[PDB]
Amino acid sequence: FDELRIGLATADDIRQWSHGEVKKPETINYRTLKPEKDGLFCEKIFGPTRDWECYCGKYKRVRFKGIICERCGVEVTRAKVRRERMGHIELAAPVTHIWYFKGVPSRLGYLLDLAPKDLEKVIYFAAYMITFVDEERRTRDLPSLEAHVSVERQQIEQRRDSDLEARAKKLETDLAELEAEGAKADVRRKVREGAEREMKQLRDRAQREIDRLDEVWNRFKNLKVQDLEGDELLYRELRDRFGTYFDGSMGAAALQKRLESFDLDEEAERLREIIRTGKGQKKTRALKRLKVVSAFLQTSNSPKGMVLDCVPVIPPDLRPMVQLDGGRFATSDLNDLYRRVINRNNRLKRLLDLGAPEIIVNNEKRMLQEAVDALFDNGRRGRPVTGPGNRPLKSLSDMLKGKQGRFRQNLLGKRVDYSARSVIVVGPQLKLHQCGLPKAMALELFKPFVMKRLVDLNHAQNIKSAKRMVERGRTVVYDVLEEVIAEHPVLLNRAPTLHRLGIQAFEPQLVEGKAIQIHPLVCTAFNADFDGDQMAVHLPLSAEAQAEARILMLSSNNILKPADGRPVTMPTQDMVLGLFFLTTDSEGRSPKGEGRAFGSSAEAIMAFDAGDLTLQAKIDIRFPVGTIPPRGFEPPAREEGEPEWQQGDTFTLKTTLGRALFNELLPEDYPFVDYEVGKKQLSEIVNDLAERYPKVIVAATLDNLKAAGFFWATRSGVTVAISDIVVPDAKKEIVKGYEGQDEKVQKQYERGLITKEERTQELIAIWTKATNEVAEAMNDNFPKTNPVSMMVNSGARGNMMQMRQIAGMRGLVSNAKNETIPRPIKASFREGLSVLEYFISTHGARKGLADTALRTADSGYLTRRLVDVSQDVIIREEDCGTERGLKLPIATRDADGTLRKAEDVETSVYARMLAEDVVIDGKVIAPANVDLGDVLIDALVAHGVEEVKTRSILTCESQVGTCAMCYGRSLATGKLVDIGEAVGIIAAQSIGEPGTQLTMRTFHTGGVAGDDITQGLPRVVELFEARTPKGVAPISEASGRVRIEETEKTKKIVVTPDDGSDETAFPISKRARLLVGEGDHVEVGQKLTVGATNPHDVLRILGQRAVQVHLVGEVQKVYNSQGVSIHDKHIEIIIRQMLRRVTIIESGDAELLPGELVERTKFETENRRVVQEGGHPASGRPQLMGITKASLATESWLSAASFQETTRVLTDAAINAKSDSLIGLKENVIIGKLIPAGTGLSRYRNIRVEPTEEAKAAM
Amino acid sequence: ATADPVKDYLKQIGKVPLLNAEQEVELAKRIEAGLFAEDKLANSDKLAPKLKRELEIIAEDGRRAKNHLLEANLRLVVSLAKRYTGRGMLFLDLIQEGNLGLIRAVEKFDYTKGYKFSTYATWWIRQAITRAMADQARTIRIPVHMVEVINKLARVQRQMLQDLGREPTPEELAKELDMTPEKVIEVQKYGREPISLHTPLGEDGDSEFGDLIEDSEAVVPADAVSFTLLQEQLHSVLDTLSEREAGVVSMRFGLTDGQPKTLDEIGKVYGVTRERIRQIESKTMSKLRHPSRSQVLRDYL
Ligand SMILES: [Mg+2]
Ligand SMILES: [Zn+2]
Ligand SMILES: [Zn+2]
């Protein structure tokens, strides 16, 4: 496995693959149920149905394998050969490959300069082609044929004159004879009228034959290769009036002859000449033609692979006609399609054998073409081959495409043995790295291991008896199981697996019951609630696999979420409420036993059980030696005339017993905490622990925090009751006042004094004011001691507007299709909504549900796209070669006389490496190549620096991928990123995870469409696909004088750049709503009007730095609007990927095409080659395009084919004959080889192991 | 060139002159004239070149009349094709097969019959259509006699459903067909059609029917490992026996090679008499039957 070369398969190659020829559509005898002879499923060509068993009853045993029996010809071997061997069908008349035609002109390529209609009408037998003309021969004998035609015309005119004379004599004779007869008054006139009518008719046929002669002669003179003759009779007249000069044909045979005689080199030369001097869309057509023709010229394969001659047939085992119980059958649709093509080929052969008409044989060849097209691609032209009529039949390409195709369903995502699934319950008593497995699942997962252990301990006699005993399920089996599961990791994994914390290793543990028990701390990492939720269990098998699950995937070494580098393994639903109730100031109860000091925390606890003291009460507490005091307590100390060191000795402190308990949960070396914990500060201290302590201490501290949190939440006594939620008394009064005002307004609307729209707007404003006021009143009313306050302030669960609409009135609710009702809901859920109020609330509830579902679907799609573009970017170098960095704003919004750090400094500059040192007072403050934390950021801000030069992946100059230092420290580990880590996948997953969480949309359209820009996940996917924004505001080209022309037809904005440069005229809508002054000075960077800037232009004029900054900021603010945060490196990797290619311009010396995408590295390479050669470099302009286009235009055709679009990418891969080098990730997941990312790297996997000599000397 | 190729075929028929009586009898006359022309040309006796060319011209004219007749009756054959559509064969396919039948009928018609072509042809058109529908419509090829048996019992069963208004009992069907009930069941089971794997399994998109049925050729790894353990234990037990004894039993049961050798068959490479090798084989059978070397092998069956 070094390269999967792919290309056109010629007829000779297909013959070589085939081990025979398929001559019949027979499949199996209806009685014996065995394959027939030389048809489909034939053993003589594919292989023996039964292992080593031939067909005719002769050699029938494993011994004498590898021989052919002369009776039936079956070659005795393993039946598995039927899965490999493949045959072929010889077609009497060739056909065209449906793939390379009937598609985009990138794969068809205009190899023949004929429109798609011409091909569609010729290869389906509706018109002819002039395959070849002896034009030199026709020109050589021009005088002779011309003289012959002249003589033909002369004799035609002579005979016409004779006919005219005969007509005149007939007319005169009949007139004379009838006037002489005088049978009636005017017989002569009537007969003369008839005679002249006959003369006119004869003239009509004369001119008709003259016209036919002229048309056939001028079509003679209009001869040329590849000329289409739609009219069959006209073609026949061509053939009769002249032969041996023009050679013609119809159908695929004409295409085959044309391609055989095609001279692609001359076409390439002439097209190069045209491109040198050409204009308009003709240049683009010639460009595509040059691309395809040169792609064929460079590659060794001949173009004639377009028109196949022999059709391969899939090995029978892959299209099984498997027997079914009940006398019925199962057949795959390829059987039907192969039967159809074989039948039609047989009929064509029979029709050719006997002398048959042209019409029937041509229609038959067309039928064969349709059958082959249906075989490769059913449904690519007109109606599909519906077969039974209930559903379209499957075809070869259909199995290789789509969600259910092979690439995405049976190569990337496979089913796996040694696994299980069950509902999950919560187990608190477990430790952080433990998971409970019910008895049955554990016993079934570990069957091989339980068998081995049972045989080794002699509980079972032999292996089969061990199988029987485990199936029986005796107690000794369970004992052996309890012995065997331990020290063996199992990966628990939930279905969505949004980010890499989805799959987590655990220590298994037998447990009664039937549901997995899990540690509540890790549940929020999975987003796994306990309403009802099933989580799959997977088993690492190899020593390497279980080693990985021990080290890498362990549930205790993944405290930090990779999205932004914050703790994710300290959920808050219940424990945090316990801690908050524990570290709380006074007034939580009647603080009895307040204003006293206790000799040590033990005596304080004793007093607490006595009931004199309460947990929430300020008191002075001693601490034994070693208790590190509050960080702010350090400068204060006791009073003495001798030196004292209270940083690590006894010290009294005014705190609460609760805070003492909390701190003695934390490790001794951790400085004391004297502040209420809540949720934010708990995350802060957990992050500090994760930073400054080892992992084991972190896990133990988390476990102690968990236990205390549950215990003190139990004691917290949070409840809910009818009297718990007390509606504010003032509400009723205030609202009726509002109602008075409202009805007053209604009265003055009844007289027509106000328009309905104005009434609606003012009423909406009135009720928004009312609901804000009542929200504030309720906020003031509710005490701090009530359960809802305790569990909403602490950050346990809930949100202040939820209590607002549980206690205060709901307020304005959106009407269907994004309107606002005039009459908001005036009752809260405690009082109970009214009927219409409930109805209009459901109006918004159901819309929210549907929006949530659509957003999760789109988020999944976005995640897939991001992961698929972002692969290949692995860290493959310890250190960069360069020193260039990126300028970042360290501190902004600096108030007068002071320096204020940036509000969002964390996602921007934290976890980045300084390119170079910084000196502000002449002394070095932040040494080069150090990741940034709180201390350094505070010091640098205090020293007053305004910006920093942080190294980042964008400026990274690495010959192989990107270096570790440019990417800076990872975020899930808190240390420098190890070489070989998969940054691309982590970045994509971090981008995609909050897609479901965004769920933000414009509250109301406002009656105007196109004004408000796209909001939410649509905006994100727009930014990431290089889509022109819905509301696009053009940008100024340069400085100059700008003015407005308000033409009646449409508004218009004209700007003359300064310095005499060319005037530029930009169109705009009538409702421009611009802001730049008329006839005024303009700058290069400003935006002319309101809207969303177009990234392409920003790249074009400003620079790649500008577009990088713009995209990063835009997507970051879109995410921050909801509240989610992601680090900017995740965005930056994708952004560097989008900008990778460059559009070549002025491709004179470089000799390749102009105006096509080319990779940056390739551009630099070819420029170096041409400048070394002496030729001037071909120009290029950086180009930004969406992730989809970037992914499709990749060097590994296999990876792209595994992406959304399969047929086109495969087609151009074949036509280009491009071998897919196996560097990268997805394609090495297809093959099953080892991904070159992490443990799969060469440098990690080549090590050898041997102990030291002293180890052997000892023993 | 359009979708639904049958429409383009119908247009390809276009407008052709329908043949009245005298027209077609004259065409058949020149057909037989060309027939005798080519017959005379085929003779080895020397004919003058100009007469031979005239005979070839008359034969060509007969061929032209042939294609005229065929194009005329394409309409009839498509009529007889639609008369049989909807039975697992594509309509344009049936049209082509009937066209083959029409070619045969045109090759077997003459004015010697005092009847129109449209009455003589339809028999052969129906013949070709029915034959090829029997031989190429069903995935499992049913022989023509079985096709007529199945369709006969089907149509008569439909009839008895019509009269009795109820599902007929098997014995009544058997006496109606005049065959025995066993043949009735046989043909009834033989007259089925396969069900496609790639069909909606029942849910929206949960794979297809071809992703829920298991295979038999898959080697159950439990079976394979158990068999290998059996091989190891058996080989060890044989090694427990004496070298010659283990060898002779091994050849008697083919443990080295898939073909066991008869008693005399062993007595050539070993050099022992057929009765001698029989004797020691019997003693080996006894020895392995002792309870000693039987506790382990009993549990493998
Ligand atoms: Mg759930
Ligand atoms: Zn055989
Ligand atoms: Zn770098």
Side-chain angles (χ1 to χ4, degrees), chain A residues 26-27 30-31 63 79 120 328-329 331 333 340 343 347 350 360 363 366 370 391 404 462 464-465, chain B residues 1 5 8 90 93 96 100 136 139 141 190 193-198 205 217 226 257 259 296 299:
Chain A
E26 271 195 337
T27 63
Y30 94 113
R31 246 169 61 75
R63 278 260 291 157
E120 186 110 328
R328 274 297 181 161
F329 258 91
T331 298
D333 310 348
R340 179 161 302 105
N343 281 297
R347 195 182 301 97
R350 199 196 336 280
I360 270 174
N363 164 242
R366 193 223 191 172
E370 263 140 31
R391 168 206 70 258
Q404 305 299 339
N462 287 9
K464 282 295 230 192
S465 99
Chain B
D8 161 78
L90 275 300
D93 213 340
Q96 259 288 345
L100 196 48
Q136 299 182 3
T139 322
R141 205 221 80 184
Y190 285 135
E193 194 64 26
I195 175 59
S196 190
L197 288 90
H198 314 276
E217 256 186 336
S226 70
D257 79 317
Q259 169 263 313
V296 294
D299 231 18

Side-chain angles (χ1 to χ4, degrees), chain A residues 52 170 208 238 271 290 362 408 464 500 627 668 731 779 826 896 1020 1137 1167 1186:
Chain A
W52 288 287
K170 166 260 281 148
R208 106 172 67 255
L238 264 81
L271 272 161
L290 276 180
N362 286 327
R408 294 187 68 213
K464 282 295 230 192
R500 57 168 245 187
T627 308
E668 78 300 341
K731 185 179 88 72
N779 190 359
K826 321 304 196 294
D896 305 358
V1020 179
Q1137 276 294 337
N1167 278 273

Side-chain angles (χ1 to χ4, degrees), chain A residues 122-272:
Chain A
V122 74
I123 59 141
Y124 276 78
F125 301 90
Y128 276 96
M129 281 155 78
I130 311 318
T131 169
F132 154 69
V133 301
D134 302 81
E135 190 62 23
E136 77 299 326
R137 191 192 178 189
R138 198 214 74 181
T139 49
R140 178 174 20 269
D141 69 325
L142 272 163
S144 48
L145 51 94
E146 286 164 0
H148 302 148
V149 160
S150 70
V151 169
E152 292 146 36
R153 303 325 295 284
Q154 289 150 39
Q155 57 85 5
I156 286 280
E157 300 328 309
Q158 292 149 32
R159 293 186 180 176
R160 197 78 274 166
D161 300 0
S162 74
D163 301 341
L164 263 82
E165 293 152 40
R167 279 176 253 176
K169 298 334 178 271
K170 166 260 281 148
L171 183 140
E172 179 53 46
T173 312
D174 61 54
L175 171 136
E177 87 196 45
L178 249 66
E179 70 183 357
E181 286 152 33
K184 305 97 177 176
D186 207 13
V187 291
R188 66 101 186 163
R189 197 179 297 185
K190 295 177 285 198
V191 63
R192 202 222 65 256
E193 288 160 358
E196 59 177 357
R197 289 169 190 174
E198 296 153 22
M199 282 144 99
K200 291 166 185 179
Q201 297 161 338
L202 198 33
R203 287 177 192 173
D204 304 344
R205 37 184 66 75
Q207 57 78 35
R208 106 172 67 255
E209 55 83 8
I210 288 156
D211 299 356
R212 300 290 62 68
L213 211 167
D214 303 350
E215 89 85 11
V216 63
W217 193 237
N218 65 37
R219 180 47 56 85
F220 205 162
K221 305 293 150 298
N222 186 36
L223 283 163
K224 74 204 71 52
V225 302
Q226 311 209 32
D227 183 348
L228 187 133
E229 311 309 320
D231 179 18
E232 80 297 9
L233 156 54
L234 155 56
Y235 173 89
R236 187 141 288 103
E237 289 177 348
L238 264 81
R239 283 289 310 93
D240 325 292
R241 281 284 290 239
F242 48 53
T244 82
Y245 278 64
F246 100 89
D247 320 66
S249 170
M250 179 181 338
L255 266 64
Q256 159 170 7
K257 297 157 62 56
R258 188 63 269 192
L259 269 45
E260 165 281 340
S261 60
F262 196 63
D263 297 336
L264 80 178
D265 55 330
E266 309 308 313
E267 167 150 314
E269 296 155 18
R270 181 193 40 60
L271 272 161
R272 300 247 199 271

Side-chain angles (χ1 to χ4, degrees), chain A residues 753-769:
Chain A
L753 330 171
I754 172 155
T755 73
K756 63 100 186 178
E757 187 63 32
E758 295 163 356
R759 203 294 312 277
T760 50
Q761 299 319 304
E762 61 86 39
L763 194 54
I764 287 299
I766 283 163
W767 283 118
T768 304
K769 192 152 47 66

Side-chain angles (χ1 to χ4, degrees), chain B residues 136-147:
Chain B
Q136 299 182 3
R138 296 161 146 281
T139 322
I140 43 164
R141 205 221 80 184
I142 300 283
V144 62
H145 77 95
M146 272 296 288
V147 188

